[PDB]
Paper text:
We used electron cryo-microscopy (cryo-EM) to determine the structures of Aβ40 filaments from the leptomeninges of individuals with Alzheimer’s disease and cerebral amyloid angiopathy. Filaments are made of pairs of protofilaments, the ordered core of which comprises D1–G38. The different filament types comprise one, two or three protofilament pairs. The ordered core of each protofilament consists of residues D1–G38 and comprises four β-strands (β1–β4) that extend from residues 2–8, 10–13, 15–22 and 34–36, respectively.
Numbering used by the authors:
A (entry chain F), B (entry chain F), C (entry chain F), D (entry chain A), E (entry chain A), F (entry chain A), ...: 1 to 38
Amino acid sequence: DAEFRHDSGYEVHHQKLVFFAEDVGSNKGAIIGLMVGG
Amino acid sequence: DAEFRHDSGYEVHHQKLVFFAEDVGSNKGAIIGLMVGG
Amino acid sequence: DAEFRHDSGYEVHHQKLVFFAEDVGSNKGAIIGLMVGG
Amino acid sequence: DAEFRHDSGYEVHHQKLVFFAEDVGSNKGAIIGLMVGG
Amino acid sequence: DAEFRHDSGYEVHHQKLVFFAEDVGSNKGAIIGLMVGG
Amino acid sequence: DAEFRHDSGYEVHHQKLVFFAEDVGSNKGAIIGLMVGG
Amino acid sequence: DAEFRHDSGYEVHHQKLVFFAEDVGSNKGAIIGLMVGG
Amino acid sequence: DAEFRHDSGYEVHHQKLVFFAEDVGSNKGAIIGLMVGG
Amino acid sequence: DAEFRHDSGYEVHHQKLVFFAEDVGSNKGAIIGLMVGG
Amino acid sequence: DAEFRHDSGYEVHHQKLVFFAEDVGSNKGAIIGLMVGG
Amino acid sequence: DAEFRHDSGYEVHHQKLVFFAEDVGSNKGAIIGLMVGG
Amino acid sequence: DAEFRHDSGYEVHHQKLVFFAEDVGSNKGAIIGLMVGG
């Protein structure tokens, strides 16, 4: 799960970036190419 | 699950970006190509 | 599930982008190509 | 573009799966959330 | 582009899986959240 | 681009898996969250 | 119950305030949110 | 119960304040959020 | 209960304040958040 | 301002109390008995 | 301001109390009995 | 300001109390009985 929050007060600027990310180009907890005999 | 929130106060700027993301190009918890004999 | 919220106060700007996303190009919790003998 | 082909000769089996896929949960070459001032 | 091909000769087996995939949970060459002032 | 090929001769087996994949959970050549002032 | 009384004799002044109050923003002897099983 | 009384004799002044108060922002003898099983 | 009384004789002054108060921001003898099993 | 929320899942009980309150017997931000000469 | 939240999962009990409160018998930020000569 | 949160998982009990409070019988940031000559 993800809980993202951003709260702004008094801000003066030319440029501002806020970047919040969890899974970007990811295979978390994945099973890929499994073989079981029985 | 995802809970995203953004609250603005007093903001003065030329440019501002807020980017919130969870699963971008992802296969979280996926099973791909599994083989079971019995 | 997703719960997205954005609240604006006092904002003055040339450009502003708010981008909220959960599953973009994703196969979360998917089963693809599974084979079971019995 | 896709050019998928499968030819079977002499095959004997309990189970056989052939899985050919392209762009499964994808946004290839897509523009999402773009802003140009002029 | 994809050019997928499979040819079977003399094959005998309990289970056989052939899995050919391209761009599974992908955003290849995508533009997401871009801002240009002019 | 992908050029995937598999040719079977004389094969006898309990289980056989052939897994060919490209760009699985990937953002190759993608632009995410870019800002240019002018 | 309230018994408020003010008697003026010989008084000379720019400003005079007499403030008599009882139960201002009060919940005296109140039952709020009570639960009895039997 | 309140018994408030003020008697003025010979008084000369720029400013005079008499402030008599009882139970200002109070919950005297109140039951809030009580639970009894039986 | 309150019994507040003020009597003025011969008084001459720039400023005079008489402040009589009882239970200002108080929860005297209150029950808050009580639980009994039986 | 007040933002109150309660969400129930799987609940089994003899008795349950949820009590949410902000201003109970309160004079928040109040002016009482002010005197200004000019 | 107040932001109160309660979320229930799997709960089994004889008795449960949740009590959330901010200003109970309070005079926060109040001016009471002020005198200014000019 | 106050931000109160309670999240329940797997709970089994005879009795449970959660009590969250900020200002109970309080005069935070209050001015009471001030006198200024000018």
